[PDB]
Each structure stands twice: as C-alpha cells, then as structure tokens.
Symmetry: D2
Subunit: 115 residues, 4 copies
C-alpha cells in the first residue's frame, strides 16, 4: 500500500498501539474530504489505508488522535491531535511512511518517501 | 503575553527567521476562526500574539507556514505547514510556549507550560 | 537478534544508508570495551550486531557516526556522533530497537524495548 | 557566555529543573578532561559554564544526568545519560545553545549557533 503510518510511545518505549487516525484529502472546494481511517496494530503500524489507484495526487492530512490515545491510558496530554499535511504524488506515484513519536507534551513526525 | 511561539531550523542550527504563522480558535460550529498571526523575529520568536483577557479556554490551532520558509532557502520540503492543536486550560500553568523544530521531511513540536 | 538500530535522514526523507556505528560495553575497570560494529543497509537498518548469548547484562554505548555520515554527503554537521548509553537486560533478556532521526544540527533517538 | 544548555521535560511540558551535567574537552591523548559542570536553573537553563577566552576550538562532550532526573520523579528511564559531542568552530557563529528534550525512552538534542 502506498501510505503507511507507524507510531511510537516515548514514555513506555513501546509501539503506540490502538492509535486512531483519520486521513483527509483536500477537495476542489478547499474542504477536507474523509479519505481513510484506521488504528495502529500491536506493532504500532497502520497498513492498508488506501490503494495505488485511489491514492491520487492531492493534499492529504493525516490526523493522529493523540489525545484519544493518552486519555485511554489515563494521561492528560497537551495536544488534541498530531497533524501531518502534505502534497502527495505530485511527481508521480510514491510510497509514504509517516512516523510519529509521542510524548504527553511533545511529538515528532517524519516522512520517508520512496520511489 | 500568555502565548509565545519559537521556531528553530535543524538544518542550519539557527532560529527560523521570518516564518509566518496564523493562530485560530475553534468556534461552536467546529470551524476555525482567525485569532492572531505574525512572523518570527530574528530570534525565531513571535511575541505579542494575544493578551490574558482575550486568551480564554478553548481549542486553538497554530498553523506555521514551514513550506514557504524552506522554499525561500531553495529547499523543497515535505509538509504543507506545521500544525499545533491544543486546548488552553486555566487549571494548569498560565504561560504557553510552543516550540517547533523544523527539518525538510520532519518536524517536532513541544509545549512548555509555566507559571 | 536482540539489538537492532534504524536510522532516518530528516533532510532527504529517506533511510540513512551506510551509517557506521560502534557498540561498546562497560568493562569491570570502567573502560568502554569494543562489543560490535556495522553499517546501516539500504533500508537504514543494522541487523545482526550480536546474539542472545553474547548480549549479557551490562551498560552499552551505541556510537552512531553521524559526522562521518554527513561528511560523506558533503555536509558539515554539528555533532561528532550520536551516543546512546543504556543498561541492557537488567530485568532479564529483552529485545532493543534503537531508532535515530538525523538532521545536520539536531538528532533524536528512541528505544523500543520488547519482552 | 559562549555556551548555554537548556533542558526540557516532554512528559510534564516544563523546564527540566535541577538537572546535573558535566562538560568535558577531548585531550591530545583522546581522554575526556573535565571542563565545566553545573545544574539547570528553574528555567531549565545552565548559564556561565565557560568564558570566551577559555572556550577554544576543540571537541567537547556534554554529559547530562537524565537518569537521576527521571528517578527523582519516580520514573524508570532508558538512558544512562544524554550525551552531546561536538566540535567548537571559530569559522562559524560564536554563541552555542545546546537544547535537550527529554522523555523516559527518547531524547532529542539541537544546537542553535548564533552571532
């Protein structure tokens, strides 16, 4: 699949399991249209969000529901979610891995783009 | 001055100067209302966005125009913009410092909340 | 293998390939004894550094040769290397993945510890 | 004041206060000679480590005692200490700010070099 997300928990030193995420794609009217969603597995990875055919060029937003993740663990974090907004496939099809590293008051995201 | 934003450049090891950003507050209808904006100084900091009486509890979004920063340096980056979305909370400390560390394909944000 | 290292390049949005690293283990005399070494593959990963039998309890240092990596790409970075120093296996055998994210003037390391 | 160190706590969203650190300078025999030390203030900063005339070009190591910080909070961390190893260079800017962001199983350091 051309879009995968992996999430780590910097407090536990573990993959962040059951992190919900919603992907949106900017529509012609400049609105965010729902594109795909899912939750991380026990490996902290979310595979199978989309297909090469459906993952056309556009501007995508991956909302990672970090507040819902920390609150499900009984922790009150700072951010509502982590957002990753990027243009995809504008030079032809690519594979995107979006990594995220979570702490209650800090996070880091990184993209690995392969052809 | 209850809200400050500081932006650093991880490629050059410098403050990120002249970085534009807009702050929004979430309205009752779930839309983002413009709240404040500015661009970072020679120290990479943006002061004076708001005041204590105006900065009431609620959900805020800081949208940092990282793509324009990198393009002005002749570098093509991954993200359209860096986003920091959070709830302001009176039960906690009263000063919010949002820091963002920028790289072309990665960005980490941290919140430092002090009294 | 119970110790793996993965390295990403935040400038290119790519696995950091051919990053050399040297692992040391603290000896009884408080010196750092050479334990294992290798370089990242095209996936940015270094597998096979050690075995369950040889990876005994102790204090280990993973030196990641980030300067040698950036200089081989014609970039002058800030750090000499990235160091990761940790006690391993003190509660019994574990598997350790050490992740590192590199920029010329900044890096981040993260440990995933599994049983 | 050519060298300052700032330490932040990513779990609590605060300066990391009372964090001890030692700075070493690499000697001609490749050993680490003690150079300066101190502990972070209520702002998470350590000022006054050295002076311009003493801080000559060479390789320096800042060893930050992160393990003691986390244990004082009742948290068991991964790393023995955070290490920042770098060459001071006169050709570049003259002020060095080393920042470290701490989480139990992860830590990111950045250098901000300004004039």
């Amino acid at each position: 699949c051309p879009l995968m997300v992996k999430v780590l928990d910097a407090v536990r030193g573990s993959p962040a399991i059951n992190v919900a995420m919603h992907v949106f794609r900017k529509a012609a009217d400049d609105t965010w249209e729902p594109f795909a969603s899912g939750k991380t597995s026990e490996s902290g990875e979310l595979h199978g969000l989309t297909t090469e055919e459906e993952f056309v060029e556009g501007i995508y937003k991956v909302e990672i529901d970090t507040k819902s993740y920390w609150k499900a663990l009984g922790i009150s974090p700072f951010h509502e979610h982590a957002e990753v907004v990027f243009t995809a496939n504008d030079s032809g099809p690519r594979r995107y891995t979006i990594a995220a590293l979570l702490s209650p008051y800090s996070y880091s995201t990184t993209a690995v783009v392969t052809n």
